[PDB]
RNA sequence: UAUAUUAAUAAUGUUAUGAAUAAUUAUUAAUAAUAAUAAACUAAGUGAACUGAAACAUCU
RNA sequence: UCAUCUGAUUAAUUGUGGUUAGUAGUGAAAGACAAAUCUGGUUUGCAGAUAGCUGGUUUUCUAUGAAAUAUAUGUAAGUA
RNA sequence: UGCUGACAUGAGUAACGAAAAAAAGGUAUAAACCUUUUCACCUAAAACAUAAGGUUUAACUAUAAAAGUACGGCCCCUAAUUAAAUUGAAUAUAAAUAUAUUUAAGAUGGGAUAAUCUAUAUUAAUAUUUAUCUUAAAAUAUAUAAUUAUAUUAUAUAUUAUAUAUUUAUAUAAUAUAAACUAAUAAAGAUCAGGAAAAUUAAUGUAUACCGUAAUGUAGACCGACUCAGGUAUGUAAGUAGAGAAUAUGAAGGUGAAUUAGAUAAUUAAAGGGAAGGAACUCGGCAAAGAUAGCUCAUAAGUUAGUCAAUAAAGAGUAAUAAGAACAAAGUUGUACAACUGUUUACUAAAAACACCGCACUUUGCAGAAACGAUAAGUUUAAGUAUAAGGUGUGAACUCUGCUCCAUGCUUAAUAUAUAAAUAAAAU
RNA sequence: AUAAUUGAGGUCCCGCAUGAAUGACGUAAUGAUACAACAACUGUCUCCCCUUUAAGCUAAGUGAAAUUGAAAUCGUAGUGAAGAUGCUAUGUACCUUCAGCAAGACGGAAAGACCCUAUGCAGCUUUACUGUAAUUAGAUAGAUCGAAUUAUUGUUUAUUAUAUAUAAUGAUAAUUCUAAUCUUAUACUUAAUUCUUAAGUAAUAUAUAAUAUAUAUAUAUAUUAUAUAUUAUAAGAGA
RNA sequence: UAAUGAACAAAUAACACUGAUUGUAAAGGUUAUUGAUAACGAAUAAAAGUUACGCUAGGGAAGGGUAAUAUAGCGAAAGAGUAGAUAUUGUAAGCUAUGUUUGCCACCUUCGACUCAACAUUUCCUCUUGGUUGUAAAAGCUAAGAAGGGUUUGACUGUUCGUCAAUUAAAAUGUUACGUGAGUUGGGUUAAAUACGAUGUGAAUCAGUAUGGUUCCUAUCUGCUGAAGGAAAUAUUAUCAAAUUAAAUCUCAUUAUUAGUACGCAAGGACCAUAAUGAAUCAACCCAUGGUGUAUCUAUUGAUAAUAAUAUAAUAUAUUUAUUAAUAUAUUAUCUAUAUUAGUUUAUAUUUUAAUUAUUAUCAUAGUAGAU
RNA sequence: AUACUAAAAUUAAUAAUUAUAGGUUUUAUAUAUUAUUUAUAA
């Protein structure tokens, strides 16, 4: 069937699995949070 | 239908038809053949009708004379179940039926 | 409810039934807590493969 | 897309959440799917991996100017 | 087929993306915007309310109004599940971390009061899914307390007239269409045996928090590179007609499009009809054509006895005897493969391949086999116990499954038997 | 069976090269599976014709794409890195277009398709080579982590049999005991509100000594005294 | 003239050369000898296959040449031909031509069907002619000139081919990238799926079998089919126009007459020529016939909307009557509301004034049938 | 006649002659009722 519509939005899932606390509350999540910060990125997380 | 040509099960007219005692039955969780890692440790096991794991006595420590009131069918056991009622205390219980 | 709790006091209202008593207003003593905090350098543990050997396994 | 065709009370369809994935999951089993297609994804790093292979390598004038044979080679697209 | 920027050719060519429009006026500025009328399309939607999503795109900055009584979130409670959290020394592990117990979080779920409108706080004491069948009786029609047939099997609130505390409530008695449909107890059939968690009184008390609210939401307002014929959850979805949410019209609503105006050449696509033949076409009846009820009867051979065959083919009853909407409805047989319903190659293979119920072998006695665990604790197996669980092959059923363990394994018995590691002591 | 059949069905069997759970054979139903036959039906065909709508064409507005060494881009024969718009000879052709056709420009782009090379890559197989998880076995001739009894047998010493016994030292097998291991379940008072130490005594449990009673030196009960405890208890495996 | 093997690592003995603080030693060194790398200049002490599920970097590290083969001819004539090699036939050997089959070299990396065909003649039929003790006639055999016209429809198979059936005058042979996929189809052939037979220990494989299975293009240039504009015209315009150039056509069969004549014992049965019927192909036409005919008319099922007439009610303007009532005209409307136990629809009663006819219209494939 | 082109017909309204398309009239065709009937008067 037709494809391309893989991203079906949902604020709950988007925030729960890519949000700031979804990464600030884990070792691996924190590591990528600080890596983006060191690179100088404005938007640390979702 | 062709699916009924080999449907064959024993009929026991004496088996209970009502629901079991809620005070003993507890919910049976479905793991899907998956261990705490999430992987399927045991294969070929999957979803099915919802069930309640009955609590059947397998020790019978307390003892004393007891009378059976109804012989029921346990969805989680190949054997039947008997609801015992103590002749003095009146406590109820389930035991593997003979 | 830290503009907080307990205790004391002056008053009010005020139950209770002069005194008590809490509620309130206002004073004084005690009771309590705020982690974004760098990178590189150093040391320690585990530790590859591509590659070279014009192949490859000891070796690198 | 249209016509035609199949199931349509079930091993059915579907909404909202959750678990399982990179030697690695799910799989009524097709080497099917894991964010437009997996005999094993993507990103960063080792890393300018290696390439006896292909392509490219920029102004002028002057003098000399070949070979494609022999030997050896896991060697016949290479090299001495 | 070098990287970046600018500009050419294809070329003013293809295309402008399902479509009905017309006049008059705003406006001696309009095919494209607004209004009025006519016509048309969608109408169990292209309408009306919503959920999620989103550059607020809306009838807009002077903008989306909540104590609650059908208003949701918020808050209490938990499911699946998650957790740098808790437990001289919980257990395990090169670190990372994993496991078990607690605690906390987590809706897609549960949460008394209410138009005769209602009051949530503080203190003290003690329900899986599924049907409403048959008899009975009342009441009715033809017949004579007997018989045939017939709507009904239970509630939903108005009026009249009476009795109670006294024109507020209850009770009684009588009257009051049919077809759907709604929530509540009732009654009862099957195995596939059907969630978790958070009290009553007595007194006192309530000045009603925060957030959501526009419009689009079967789409120009979301996911699809696009104002993309694709994907997107829920409830009503006028009537007429029907068994029906099929099919035909359409009341009301919305709507008629970033392309227009002429002739419609050859040719292409989607449709309508076609004389005489009727498969001669073609790899192959691919495509197209073919329907004499849709209700009530009737319905063979074979057969695993199952109207399976079967919606049997032909046939009959109801006005039709020349026809006049749409939808449902498209024959018979032999053979090969597979028992059948199902699954499969998202995007060239849907099958004879996978699964299947059934048959057969084998491992495991639970302090177990099987699987996972840089590797263990431990987890699934299972809150199960040989009629159970794991693995293997075949694959419903009728008639059957003959022979041989040579080779690779498996399994039982034999010190028959070599060899590694580990050690003393003692000779050259 | 058809006018005629390499297709279909039945039958026969030198089965190149069937055969019984890699199941064998014959059925009923099922099948959008594959092949074949009959009836109807038809524009599939003889043989194509007419008609409608959206394009195609024209005018207005907007406006891509693959491709492109430069082009002033004809035919035939010959030649040629072997099939010429471009070389040689010769012929034809006034300049520019529009709607069509699709024979060539070895037409264009995805992407075709097969070979050979690389001391290239990846998956899969195995009695290819080399390791390894896993499983199995030994180390009182290693550790954690010790003993007793019984039975068979090996070798030897004093004593014997002949031209067979005792004893010592081991090994094998079984059985038993355990604080080896391992599994499973559940009061007062002083000294430093709660915690801790400490002399004394209360009560429970265990062990020893003495006294008294009752049965066949031994068993059972009671009292006195001394010592310890306030992780254990129960079950299982066990050197 | 062949009777062979490098280093490395080890082994044995001899020399007295070093001896890692010194003395020894250990160890190395020089000399002599030993064992095979046969892929024999020997990559390690130690290594086989499968891939159609495949991937990357590269090279090609039907046309063309040849003509053994194949087709055809020529020279000579052994032998058949009742007689006679040369009417017809023509062993084996010889000389050639073509590149239509099977091959060989490596310069160069899709069979069949549908549609349209163009070209050659090595002529299948039609036209003229020579030979034929084997031309009596008619049918025939062989050969020469001849390419103007023509050269099939079905069953089977994916087939070209081939067998068969029914016709014809005949159902010829080739070339054109074995013509024609930027023209169509795609049945065979091959890629992913699956199964059977055989091979293999298997993974998989087959000059095997069977079911299923993706291609696309808007034409710039050449060329071609049609249509225009500019132009240079033995120099204008309107009209008529010959030679010429390009191309189309060119036929074939049956019957009848000659004539049952010629020929022939008989059977059978003419040449030469003419006419009439047709076949195939092409061009033109719509008077008539069939088709179509979204021109049109009629019939008909369901639903909705509208115009006119009539009845009712209200408003407005004129007239009569007495702001009432009535006539004329115009406009507007045929609603609504309550009850029948909760909701919706309908039905009836209740309230109001809430009408019947006639003729249209739209939708259902042009709704559908019959005509035209 | 035709894709756009091109060809062909008319563009008369005057002292006289000229019809290109639409419309109108006549005749005819088609469709389908009609003699039980159409227009008129006496
Ligand atoms: Mg995307
Ligand atoms: Mg998730
Ligand atoms: Mg299993
Ligand atoms: Mg290397
Ligand atoms: Mg079915
Ligand atoms: Mg169905
Ligand atoms: Mg059911
Ligand atoms: Mg495969
Ligand atoms: Mg991707
Ligand atoms: Mg895949
Ligand atoms: Mg490196
Ligand atoms: Mg590189
Ligand atoms: Mg020189
Ligand atoms: Mg040279
Ligand atoms: Mg070599
Ligand atoms: Mg070389
Ligand atoms: Mg090379
Ligand atoms: Mg460049
Ligand atoms: Mg063009
Ligand atoms: Mg064009
Ligand atoms: Mg266009
Ligand atoms: Mg206007
Ligand atoms: Mg519908
Ligand atoms: Mg309706
Ligand atoms: Mg809406
Ligand atoms: Mg909670
Ligand atoms: Mg909720
Ligand atoms: Mg909203
Ligand atoms: Mg709203
Ligand atoms: Mg859309
Ligand atoms: Mg978007
Ligand atoms: Mg309407
Ligand atoms: Mg709308
Ligand atoms: Mg549009
Ligand atoms: Mg016809
Ligand atoms: Mg007919
Ligand atoms: Mg045929
Ligand atoms: Mg044919
Ligand atoms: Mg069909
Ligand atoms: Mg029968
Ligand atoms: Mg149908
Ligand atoms: Mg058979
Ligand atoms: Mg099947
Ligand atoms: Mg099926
Ligand atoms: Mg597919
Ligand atoms: Mg398919
Ligand atoms: Mg089973
Ligand atoms: Mg295990
Ligand atoms: Mg089993
Ligand atoms: Mg099988
Ligand atoms: Mg069976
Ligand atoms: Mg089978
Ligand atoms: Mg057998
Ligand atoms: Mg040893
Ligand atoms: Mg035959
Ligand atoms: Mg056939
Ligand atoms: Mg057969
Ligand atoms: Mg077998
Ligand atoms: Mg059958
Ligand atoms: Mg234009
Ligand atoms: Mg040439
Ligand atoms: Mg020249
Ligand atoms: Mg072309
Ligand atoms: Mg074209
Ligand atoms: Mg090489
Ligand atoms: Mg060596
Ligand atoms: Mg010396
Ligand atoms: Mg020394
Ligand atoms: Mg030495
Ligand atoms: Mg080797
Ligand atoms: Mg294959
Ligand atoms: Mg050639
Ligand atoms: Mg002779
Ligand atoms: Mg010869
Ligand atoms: Mg000739
Ligand atoms: Mg003759
Ligand atoms: Mg001539
Ligand atoms: Mg060809
Ligand atoms: Mg050919
Ligand atoms: Mg096989
Ligand atoms: Mg198919
Ligand atoms: Mg002329
Ligand atoms: Mg002539
Ligand atoms: Mg001709
Ligand atoms: Mg005609
Ligand atoms: Mg005519
Ligand atoms: Mg006619
Ligand atoms: Mg006609
Ligand atoms: Mg409509
Ligand atoms: Mg004039
Ligand atoms: Mg005229
Ligand atoms: Mg005139
Ligand atoms: Mg006219």
Short mmCIF file of N, CA, C and O (backbone and C1' of nucleotides) in Angstrom, two decimals, chain E residues 185-203:
data_model
loop_
_atom_site.label_atom_id
_atom_site.label_comp_id
_atom_site.label_asym_id
_atom_site.label_seq_id
_atom_site.Cartn_x
_atom_site.Cartn_y
_atom_site.Cartn_z
P U E 185 -29.25 -4.19 35.90
"O5'" U E 185 -30.58 -4.56 36.70
"C5'" U E 185 -30.53 -5.07 38.03
"C4'" U E 185 -31.80 -5.79 38.40
"C3'" U E 185 -32.07 -7.08 37.64
"O3'" U E 185 -31.39 -8.19 38.20
"C1'" U E 185 -34.03 -5.75 37.67
P A E 186 -31.09 -9.50 37.32
"O5'" A E 186 -32.53 -10.16 37.13
"C5'" A E 186 -33.32 -10.53 38.25
"C4'" A E 186 -34.78 -10.64 37.88
"C3'" A E 186 -35.08 -11.62 36.76
"O3'" A E 186 -35.19 -12.96 37.22
"C1'" A E 186 -36.13 -9.57 36.29
P A E 187 -33.88 -13.73 37.72
"O5'" A E 187 -34.14 -15.23 37.26
"C5'" A E 187 -35.47 -15.73 37.19
"C4'" A E 187 -35.95 -15.82 35.77
"C3'" A E 187 -35.18 -16.75 34.86
"O3'" A E 187 -35.49 -18.12 35.07
"C1'" A E 187 -35.63 -14.73 33.73
P A E 188 -34.31 -19.16 35.35
"O5'" A E 188 -33.57 -19.27 33.94
"C5'" A E 188 -34.31 -19.46 32.75
"C4'" A E 188 -33.41 -19.72 31.57
"C3'" A E 188 -32.25 -20.67 31.85
"O3'" A E 188 -32.00 -21.49 30.71
"C1'" A E 188 -31.42 -18.61 31.06
P G E 189 -31.02 -22.76 30.84
"O5'" G E 189 -30.11 -22.67 29.54
"C5'" G E 189 -30.40 -23.46 28.39
"C4'" G E 189 -29.33 -23.30 27.35
"C3'" G E 189 -27.91 -23.59 27.83
"O3'" G E 189 -27.59 -24.97 27.79
"C1'" G E 189 -27.95 -21.52 26.70
P A E 190 -26.20 -25.48 28.38
"O5'" A E 190 -25.12 -24.83 27.41
"C5'" A E 190 -24.86 -25.39 26.13
"C4'" A E 190 -23.67 -24.73 25.49
"C3'" A E 190 -22.40 -24.78 26.32
"O3'" A E 190 -21.71 -26.01 26.16
"C1'" A E 190 -22.74 -22.58 25.52
P U E 191 -20.83 -26.62 27.35
"O5'" U E 191 -19.35 -26.17 26.97
"C5'" U E 191 -18.92 -26.17 25.62
"C4'" U E 191 -17.97 -25.03 25.35
"C3'" U E 191 -16.62 -25.15 26.05
"O3'" U E 191 -15.59 -24.61 25.22
"C1'" U E 191 -17.70 -23.17 26.75
P C E 192 -14.16 -25.32 25.17
"O5'" C E 192 -13.16 -24.19 25.67
"C5'" C E 192 -12.65 -23.22 24.76
"C4'" C E 192 -12.43 -21.88 25.41
"C3'" C E 192 -13.34 -21.55 26.58
"O3'" C E 192 -12.66 -20.69 27.49
"C1'" C E 192 -13.73 -20.01 24.83
P A E 193 -11.99 -21.27 28.83
"O5'" A E 193 -12.85 -20.62 30.00
"C5'" A E 193 -12.93 -19.21 30.14
"C4'" A E 193 -13.93 -18.80 31.19
"C3'" A E 193 -13.54 -19.10 32.63
"O3'" A E 193 -14.05 -18.08 33.49
"C1'" A E 193 -15.54 -20.23 32.12
P G E 194 -13.08 -17.31 34.51
"O5'" G E 194 -13.37 -15.77 34.22
"C5'" G E 194 -12.56 -15.03 33.32
"C4'" G E 194 -13.35 -14.02 32.54
"C3'" G E 194 -14.21 -13.07 33.36
"O3'" G E 194 -13.47 -11.99 33.90
"C1'" G E 194 -15.48 -13.92 31.56
P G E 195 -14.07 -11.11 35.10
"O5'" G E 195 -13.41 -9.68 34.89
"C5'" G E 195 -12.95 -8.92 36.00
"C4'" G E 195 -11.49 -8.58 35.86
"C3'" G E 195 -10.88 -7.79 37.01
"O3'" G E 195 -10.52 -8.62 38.09
"C1'" G E 195 -10.22 -6.85 34.94
P A E 196 -10.87 -8.20 39.60
"O5'" A E 196 -9.71 -7.20 39.99
"C5'" A E 196 -8.36 -7.62 40.02
"C4'" A E 196 -7.42 -6.46 40.22
"C3'" A E 196 -7.80 -5.52 41.35
"O3'" A E 196 -7.31 -5.96 42.60
"C1'" A E 196 -7.38 -4.27 39.39
P A E 197 -8.23 -5.89 43.91
"O5'" A E 197 -8.05 -4.40 44.42
"C5'" A E 197 -6.75 -3.88 44.70
"C4'" A E 197 -6.75 -2.38 44.66
"C3'" A E 197 -7.79 -1.70 45.52
"O3'" A E 197 -7.38 -1.58 46.87
"C1'" A E 197 -7.82 -0.75 43.36
P A E 198 -8.46 -1.45 48.04
"O5'" A E 198 -8.85 0.09 48.03
"C5'" A E 198 -7.88 1.08 48.35
"C4'" A E 198 -8.44 2.47 48.20
"C3'" A E 198 -9.77 2.73 48.89
"O3'" A E 198 -9.63 3.01 50.27
"C1'" A E 198 -9.84 3.57 46.68
P A E 199 -14.09 4.01 52.42
"O5'" A E 199 -15.60 3.93 52.94
"C5'" A E 199 -16.54 3.05 52.35
"C4'" A E 199 -17.55 2.57 53.35
"C3'" A E 199 -18.33 3.66 54.07
"O3'" A E 199 -19.46 4.10 53.33
"C1'" A E 199 -17.50 2.10 55.65
P U E 200 -20.29 5.39 53.80
"O5'" U E 200 -20.90 4.96 55.21
"C5'" U E 200 -22.07 4.16 55.29
"C4'" U E 200 -22.61 4.12 56.69
"C3'" U E 200 -22.97 5.48 57.28
"O3'" U E 200 -24.26 5.91 56.88
"C1'" U E 200 -21.67 4.25 58.84
P U E 201 -24.84 7.31 57.39
"O5'" U E 201 -25.42 6.99 58.83
"C5'" U E 201 -25.80 8.03 59.71
"C4'" U E 201 -25.28 7.79 61.10
"C3'" U E 201 -25.04 9.04 61.94
"O3'" U E 201 -26.23 9.53 62.52
"C1'" U E 201 -23.16 7.63 62.09
P A E 202 -26.83 10.95 62.05
"O5'" A E 202 -26.24 11.97 63.12
"C5'" A E 202 -26.49 11.77 64.50
"C4'" A E 202 -25.48 12.48 65.36
"C3'" A E 202 -25.11 13.89 64.91
"O3'" A E 202 -26.07 14.86 65.28
"C1'" A E 202 -23.15 12.69 65.42
P A E 203 -26.38 16.09 64.30
"O5'" A E 203 -25.23 17.13 64.64
"C5'" A E 203 -25.02 17.55 65.98
"C4'" A E 203 -23.64 18.11 66.17
"C3'" A E 203 -23.25 19.26 65.26
"O3'" A E 203 -23.77 20.51 65.68
"C1'" A E 203 -21.49 17.69 65.34
#
